[PDB]
Amino acid sequence: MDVTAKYELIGLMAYPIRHSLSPEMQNKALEKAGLPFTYMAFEVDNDSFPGAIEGLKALKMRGTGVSMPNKQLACEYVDELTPAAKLVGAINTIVNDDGYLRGYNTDGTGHIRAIKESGFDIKGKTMVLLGAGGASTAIGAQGAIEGLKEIKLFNRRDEFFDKALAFAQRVNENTDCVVTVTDLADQQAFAEALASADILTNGTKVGMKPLENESLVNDISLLHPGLLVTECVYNPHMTKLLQQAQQAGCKTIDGYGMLLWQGAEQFTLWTGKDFPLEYVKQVMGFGA
Amino acid sequence: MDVTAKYELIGLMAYPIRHSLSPEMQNKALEKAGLPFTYMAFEVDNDSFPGAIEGLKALKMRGTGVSMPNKQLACEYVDELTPAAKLVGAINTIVNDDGYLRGYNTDGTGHIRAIKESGFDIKGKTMVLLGAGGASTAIGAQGAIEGLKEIKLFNRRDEFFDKALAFAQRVNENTDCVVTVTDLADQQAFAEALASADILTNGTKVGMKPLENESLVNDISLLHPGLLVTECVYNPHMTKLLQQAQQAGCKTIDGYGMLLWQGAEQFTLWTGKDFPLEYVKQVMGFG
Ligand SMILES: NC(=O)c1ccc[n+]([C@@H]2O[C@H](COP(=O)([O-])OP(=O)(O)OC[C@H]3O[C@@H](n4cnc5c(N)ncnc54)[C@H](O)[C@@H]3O)[C@@H](O)[C@H]2O)c1
Numbered sequence: 001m002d003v004t005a006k007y008e009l010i011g012l013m014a015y016p017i018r019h020s021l022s023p024e025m026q027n028k029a030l031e032k033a034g035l036p037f038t039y040m041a042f043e044v045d046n047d048s049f050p051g052a053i054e055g056l057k058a059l060k061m062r063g064t065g066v067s068m069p070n071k072q073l074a075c076e077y078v079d080e081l082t083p084a085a086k087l088v089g090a091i092n093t094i095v096n097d098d099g100y101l102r103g104y105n106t107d108g109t110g111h112i113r114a115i116k117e118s119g120f121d122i123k124g125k126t127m128v129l130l131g132a133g134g135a136s137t138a139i140g141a142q143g144a145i146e147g148l149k150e151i152k153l154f155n156r157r158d159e160f161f162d163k164a165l166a167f168a169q170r171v172n173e174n175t176d177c178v179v180t181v182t183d184l185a186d187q188q189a190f191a192e193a194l195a196s197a198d199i200l201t202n203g204t205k206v207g208m209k210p211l212e213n214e215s216l217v218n219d220i221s222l223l224h225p226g227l228l229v230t231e232c233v234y235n236p237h238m239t240k241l242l243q244q245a246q247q248a249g250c251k252t253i254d255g256y257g258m259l260l261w262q263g264a265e266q267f268t269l270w271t272g273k274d275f276p277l278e279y280v281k282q283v284m285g286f287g288a
Numbered sequence: 289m290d291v292t293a294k295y296e297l298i299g300l301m302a303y304p305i306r307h308s309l310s311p312e313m314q315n316k317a318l319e320k321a322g323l324p325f326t327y328m329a330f331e332v333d334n335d336s337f338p339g340a341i342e343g344l345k346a347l348k349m350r351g352t353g354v355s356m357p358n359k360q361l362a363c364e365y366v367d368e369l370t371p372a373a374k375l376v377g378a379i380n381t382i383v384n385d386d387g388y389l390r391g392y393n394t395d396g397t398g399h400i401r402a403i404k405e406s407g408f409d410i411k412g413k414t415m416v417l418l419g420a421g422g423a424s425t426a427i428g429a430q431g432a433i434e435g436l437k438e439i440k441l442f443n444r445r446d447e448f449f450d451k452a453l454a455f456a457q458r459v460n461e462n463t464d465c466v467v468t469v470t471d472l473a474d475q476q477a478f479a480e481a482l483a484s485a486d487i488l489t490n491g492t493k494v495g496m497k498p499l500e501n502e503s504l505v506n507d508i509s510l511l512h513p514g515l516l517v518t519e520c521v522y523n524p525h526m527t528k529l530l531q532q533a534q535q536a537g538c539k540t541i542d543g544y545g546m547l548l549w550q551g552a553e554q555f556t557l558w559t560g561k562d563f564p565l566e567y568v569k570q571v572m573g574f575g
């Protein structure tokens with residue numbers, strides 16, 4: 001890349017982040033399209049976040065990605081939030097449209113976009129959502145807003161159970177999608193849920209390093225063919241869940257899929273251009 | 289350049305700016321040394337400057353360059369200024385050291401460096417400074433600090449005249465150099481100086497488009513060989529001042545040399561490294 005006075009800046013505000021891959025990925029996509037943008041990472045926490053936004057505006061940055069621990073706080077500094085973001089209550093993308101700041105959660109749109117790109121239609125379907133954190137909430141919010149008939153959220157009795165309930169409330173009160181929350185301990189309600197589910201989505205940490213050798217699904221007999229299973233965990237690339245999904249004839253979507261489309265969604269929001277997904281997938285070494 | 293999450297930001301706050309060459313020049317130099325920094329220009333004016341400084345600190349930028357029209361205002365937003373910066377009253381460089389901002393004016397140090405680099409010792413010498421703008425003021429303050437004998441400043445009857453007056457006072461009260469503000473209209477008193485001068489420095493817009501074929505020097509007469517003629521205008525690389533210069537046999541220092549050294553200084557202030565000046569010169573075609 002050759003940066004000149006013409007280039008505008010796109011940030012990523014989080015902490016820690018100096019070891020983030022996003023900058024390399026977006027800058028590779030940007031250079032490929034020969035666009036006058038540069039994507040950079042800045043160490044920002046809740047204390048400096050306010051001033052960083054003030055910077056975003058004064059310096060006229062095109063926008064910035066947002067990650068831990070500013071995801072929720074960020075909602076307070078934009079001028080407008082999308083419906084899905086309002087349900088999630090957290091954003092990972094900000095777009096500065098000439099001083100007017102728009103907040104987005106591309107984790108939700110990217111996951112669903114990955115689904116649709118596979119030829120799958122979520123309209124009127126049923127999803128078994130594992131989790132209630134940022135990934136799950138974002139997936140579910142977007143999913144509801146895109147047509148899901150019902151979401152059967154399952155979450156253990158931890159610090160996320162109450163968030164689940166509220167999420168269920170917000171979604172039910174502002175969408176035509178019906179959301180229910182069930183304790184992941186009620187193994188009976190789970191099996192039946194999965195049997196009636198068109199999509200099984202894992203938004204939990206389960207399956208991710210170092211606790212890779214584990215899956216929230218007891219036995220492969222719980223899954224059925226035709227069923228679509230999506231994994232948020234992309235580390236390992238092949239979780240246990242995804243491994244079982246194959247041993248059941250289930251179609252699937254891995255973590256890299258959500259990652260690339262999540263990044264593609266931001267790319268388009270900032271440049272208005274399509275994402276060179278294939279190229280980026282290849283250059284970042286995700287194909288193997 | 290391959291920007292990653294490890295690169296730190298170095299900006300340029302000014303407006304207009306999207307057509308500046310500092311970015312490429314600084315980014316060519318940085319990539320040349322494989323340094324984890326990226327120089328970027330931001331369209332910022334007096335109104336956005338306060339917010340821009342908040343970003344500089346909050347985003348933890350390594351620093352930023354400052355140009356029109358934020359040079360003067362920038363002094364009010366730093367924690368510490370250099371003696372020259374205080375005399376000049378404006379800065380073009382800001383360095384952020386873990387939250388503390390230091391202001392510098394490399395225009396002066398840069399122009400003086402170019403002088404010294406040609407084998408000239410400004411100490412105890414007389415200079416005829418044309419203009420009182422950002423350039424002239426920077427060169428003068430720095431030149432004074434570095435031993436200049438006296439500064440005979442010449443500026444027309446515009447708003448800068450008063451600026452010249454105020455500038456003369458500041459220097460004459462904090463340096464051993466003696467400055468005098470003379471009306472560029474007194475064509476007579478201009479000879480009395482240009483005659484007994486060691487160096488003639490132009491920091492006015494004359495010489496630069498749309499004032500190309502113009503010069504504050506009526507006849508080659510007033511100028512002879514050996515005389516040092518420094519030109520700040522670099523737009524028309526060969527200003528009418530140079531024509532008369534490289535025709536009267538007076539060694540000169542074009543705006544390219546000043547530009548390169550003023551940039552070298554900022555580079556080093558930010559990265560702590562030596563500026564690949566020769567490399568940049570060639571790549572930027574300044575050669
Ligand atoms: N592919 C992508 O682009 C992408 C994007 C975002 C997050 N992720 C991944 O998704 C996962 C979730 O991230 P998050 O931000 O939503 O996390 P979070 O901490 O906000 O949520 C963790 C969730 O998982 C559940 N959970 C964790 N351990 C559990 C266990 N042992 N048993 C039952 N439930 C458990 C919790 O109840 C909670 O709802 C992470 O592995 C993350 O790396 C991937």
Ligand SMILES: NC(=O)c1ccc[n+]([C@@H]2O[C@H](COP(=O)([O-])OP(=O)(O)OC[C@H]3O[C@@H](n4cnc5c(N)ncnc54)[C@H](O)[C@@H]3O)[C@@H](O)[C@H]2O)c1
Pocket residue numbers: 395418419420421422423424443444446448449472491492493494496520521522523543544546547548550
């Ligand atoms: N070498 C470098 O890196 C460098 C740095 C800064 C400025 N410059 C150049 O130097 C010039 C001056 O820049 P500045 O920032 O000092 O400008 P400024 O606006 O601050 O000052 C303009 C000066 O020129 C004088 N002037 C303008 N028209 C005049 C005229 N017709 N007759 C007599 N005097 C006249 C004014 O009195 C004033 O003192 C510009 O052309 C600029 O491109 C070069």
